[PDB]
């Protein structure tokens, strides 16, 4: 389960962690995060995120 980064501000989504405050529980892979979700720091959509190929 891979991490994703917001390319506009650097936030990193960690599927272990999730984004619970926004309704994205731990263990939610990026692709299953509802498509209306936006970066918690900067507010941008998911289409500015990239998978962290480390």
Q: Which residues bind Fe ion (CB under 5 A)?
A: 6, 9, 11, 39, 41-42
Nearer Cβ to Fe ion (24/39): 39
Q: How would you class 4 by CB atoms within 10 Å of its CB: exposed for 0-12, middle for 13-18, buried for 19 or more?
A: buried
Strands (E) located in the chain:
4-6, 12-13, 49-51
Annotated binding site for Fe cation: 6, 9, 39, 42
Nearer Cβ to Fe ion (50/54): 50
CB of 49 to Fe ion, least distance (A): 8
């Amino acid at each position: 389960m891979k991490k994703y980064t917001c390319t506009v501000c650097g936030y990193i989504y960690d599927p272990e962690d999730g984004d619970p405050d926004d309704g994205v529980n731990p263990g939610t892979d990026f692709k299953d995060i509802p498509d209306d979700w936006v970066c918690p720091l900067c507010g941008v959509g998911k289409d500015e995120f990239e998978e962290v190929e480390e």
